[PDB]
Amino acid sequence: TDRVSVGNLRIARVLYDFVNNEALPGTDIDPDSFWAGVDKVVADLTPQNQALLNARDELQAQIDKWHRRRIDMDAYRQFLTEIGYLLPEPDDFTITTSGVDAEITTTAGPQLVVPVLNARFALNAANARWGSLYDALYGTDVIPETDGAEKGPTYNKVRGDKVIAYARKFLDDSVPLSSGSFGDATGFTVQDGQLVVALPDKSTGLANPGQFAGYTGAAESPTSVLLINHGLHIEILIDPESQVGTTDRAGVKDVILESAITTIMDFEDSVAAVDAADKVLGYRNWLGLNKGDLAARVLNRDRNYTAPGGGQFTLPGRSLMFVRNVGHLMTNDAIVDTDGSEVFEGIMDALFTGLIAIHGLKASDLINSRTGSIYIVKPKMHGPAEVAFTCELFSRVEDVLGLPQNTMKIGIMDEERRTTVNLKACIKAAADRVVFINTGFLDRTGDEIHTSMEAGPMVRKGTMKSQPWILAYEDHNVDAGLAAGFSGRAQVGKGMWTMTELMADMVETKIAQPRAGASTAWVPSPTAATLHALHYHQVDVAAVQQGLAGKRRATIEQLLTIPLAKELAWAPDEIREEVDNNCQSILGYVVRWVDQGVGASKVPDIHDVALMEDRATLRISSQLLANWLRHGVITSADVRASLERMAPLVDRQNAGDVAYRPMAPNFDDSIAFLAAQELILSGAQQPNGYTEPILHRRRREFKARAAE
Ligand SMILES: Cc1ccc(F)c(C(=O)CC(=O)C(=O)O)c1Cl
Ligand SMILES: [Mg+2]
Ligand SMILES: [Mg+2]
Ligand SMILES: [Mg+2]
Predict the structure, then answer these.
(1) Are strands 252-258 and 232-238 parallel, antiparallel or unpaired?
(2) Are residues 525 and 622 in the same domain?
(3) Which of 137, 288, 339, 342 has the most neighbouring CB atoms within 10 Å?
(4) Domain end: 237, 258, 279, which one?
C-alpha cells in the first residue's frame, strides 16, 4: 500500500506528504512530535467518540419503541427525562470565552458559507468582506425587470437609474443628512474633519457627524467617502468620468458595502470528500487561505483610508474565516489502524484544520485572527456530552500543536433535537470556548423527521418551515444565547437562504432574522451577502438583543411539538407534487455528488426555483419520503415512478457538462441513480437519518469503477 506507519496508524501517503511538506513548515512543530500526537489523540479519544455514537443509537431505539405503542405531552416529556434524553437545565451562567475578534463579539452582519474544495468560490468568499451594491442591485431581481428596465447585453441606463435611486434611498435611511436627501447631492468635501455634502441651494453635514469614518484622495475633492452605521462600513466611490459616474448628479460611481463580515470555509455539508486525495485538496485550499497565497484569482489587500481628523489607517480587505469541521459520525480511510479500521474524520479534521489555521495567526508574505483564536464550527452534535467531547478533543489537539489552551474556539450548530432541548447545558459545556450558536434549521428538520419517524406521517417539506416546533426552536436559541451573555461576546446566528436567484424575496424576507435578534445569518454568495447587509443597516441588532434580554418565549412543550400531519391533510395531486418535488431535488443533488464529487449545487425544484442544495436539504427530502413510505402515504411504486420521471429532467438540466453521465434510460446502471434510490428506501435505517454513509459508499464505488 501507499501508506505511512506511525504507531498504530497507517496514513495515506498523499496526506502524510501534504502535512510534512506544506502544513508543518512555518509552525515550528516537529513533524515527529506532530505525528506521534495524532497517534496518541486518536488512540485516546476514539473509544469515547464511539461510545457517543452508541448512545445516540440507544436513545433512538427507545424512542422508536415508545411510538410503536400505540399524543400525551406530559407522558412523552417524562419518558424523555427517564431515558436521559431531556436533561435538567443547569443554573444560569455567563460565558467566559476570551480573545475573540471584533467581527464576532461586536459586529452584526452576514455570514457567508462556502465549499473549501472549490478554490475559486473560497477566494470570492474571503474577498466578499466588501461588495458592490450597484452590481448586486443591477444584476439581481431586487430591481424588477419591468418594461424598460430589463437587463440586456449592454448597460440599461433606465435600470441603472433605478439602481442609483435605490442606493440614494438606502443612504438617506442609514446615514441621514441634517437637511435634504443624498438624492440631491452635487458633491462631497471634507472640511475641518467633517463631511460636507453639497446640495443645489445649500450645503449640509450629517445628522450624526460620527457616522463619517474617513475618505480617500484629497479632502477638497475625495475619490471616496467612508461612512459607518451599526458598526458596518459604507463607501461611496466618486468618479465623474466613469460609465455610471457620468450619469450621476454627484459623480458617484458606486456604493460599496461591508458585506461578508465572517466566512465559513466548509469541509462538511457543502463538499464531497471521501478519501485522502479529496481531503488534501480541501486542506490545501484552507492552507492557501491561512497563508494568504491561495490563487486560482488572489486574496485582496487591506483597504487604505484617511481618518476624518487626518491620520492614515487600514481596514481588513478579507472576511474573518471560520472553518467547519465534519461532526462526530463519519470515518475516512485517509487513515486506518493496524486492523484496517478507518479513523474518525472529526478527530482528523481538528488536528489538520487546527494545524493549518496556525498560519492564519501569523503574517503572510494579512492575519486572520488578530486576537489569537482559531474558529471552528462543529456541526451535528447531539447534546452536552458531545459538546464536552469536542472541547476535550480541541484541548488535546492544542497540546499536540503547542498552542495555548482555548485557542481553538467553537461555533456550535444547534441543528439536532437533543441539542435544542438541552441547549443551555450545551453552551455551558463549552462556556470558555463558544463563539457562536447557530440554528442550522435544515439539519434540524431532518433530525425532527428521523427522531419521530415512528410517530406518524409528517407534514410536507414546505410546511415544516412554519411549524410550531421550528418557530419555538428559533426563539429558544436566541433566548439561550442572550441569557448566557452572548451580547458583546459571541454570535447568535440563524440559517441559510437557499433560493439563490430570488434576491427581491430575500431582501423583503430575511430581515426577519436580525429583527429576531440574530447578530448574523447565512448567505450562499457574495452577492447575497451584500444584499443581506442592507438588513443590518435597517435593524439595530444590539438594541434588539437588549430589548429581548430576560424573555422566555418558548416552552419545552412547544419545542417537543412533533410536526405530524392531521387526518386527511392532502389530495392525491398534493401528494404527487411533494413526491415529484423531493425526488427531483434528491436526484439533482446526488448525481453531481456521486459522479462528480460536487457537494453543493443549484438544483431547480418542481416550480423551477433554483435551490442551493447540500447534504442537509438532502437529509430532509430523503427522510420525508422515507417517512411517507414507512406510513403508507405513498407506495414503493410511487417512489420509483417519480425517480424515473424526474431523472431525464435532471439529465437535461446537466446536458452541457462534459463530465456528466445520463441516468436515463438505464437507471440501474447508474451508481448515482441507485444512490438516490437507496437514500430513500434505506433512509429510515440511516443513523439519525444521516446521508453521509450512503453518499460516501457510492461516491467511492463510482471512483473505483472509473478506474477500470
Ligand atoms: C451552502 C449551503 C447551502 C445549503 C445549506 F443548507 C447549507 C447548510 O449547511 C445548512 C445548514 O448547516 C443547516 O441548516 O443545517 C449550506 Cl452551507
Ligand atoms: Mg447543517
Ligand atoms: Mg440606527
Ligand atoms: Mg435506527
Answers:
(1) antiparallel
(2) no
(3) 137
(4) 258
Under 8 Å between Cβ of 376 and 408: yes
Neighbours of 637 (CB within 10 A): 8
Those residues whose C-beta lies under 8 Å from the C-beta of residue 24, and which sit 6 or more positions away, are 31, 34, 355
Distance 666 CA to ligand 1 centre (A): 32
324 is an active site residue: yes
Question: After which residues, if any, is the chain broken (C to N > 2.5 Å)?
Answer: 70, 296, 365
| Residue of 419, 420, 496 to mutate, ligand 1, most atoms within 8 A of C-beta | 496
Q: Which of 254, 614, 638, 651 is catalytic?
A: 614
Strands, sheet with 212-218, edge to edge from the N-terminal-most edge strand: 130-132, 252-258, 232-238, 221-229, 212-218, 303-306, 312-315
Q: What is the CATH number of the domain that holds 656?
A: 1.20.1220.12
Question: Of the residues 258, 273, 289, which one is the last residue of a structural domain?
Answer: 258
Which SS3 state, helix, strand or coil, does residue 374 take? Answer: strand
Q: Is 443 in the pocket of ligand 1 (CB under 6 A)?
A: yes
- Please check whether residues 392 and 530 belong to one and the same domain: yes
Active site residue: 10, 159, 303, 324, which one? 324
Atom 12 of ligand 1, residue of closest alpha carbon: 440
Residue 228 forms beta bridges with which residues? 233
Q: Which domain holds residue 223?
A: 130-258
Both 51 and 171 in one domain: the answer is no
Q: How many Å apart are CA 316 and CA 49, to the nearest integer?
A: 39
Question: Given CA atoms 648, 650, 652, 656 in this order, what sign does their dihedral have?
Answer: negative
Residues 557, 589, single domain; the answer is no
Same domain flag for 301 and 357 = yes
Number of domains in the chain: 3
Q: Tell me the CA–centroid distance for residue 687 and ligand 4, in Å.
A: 6
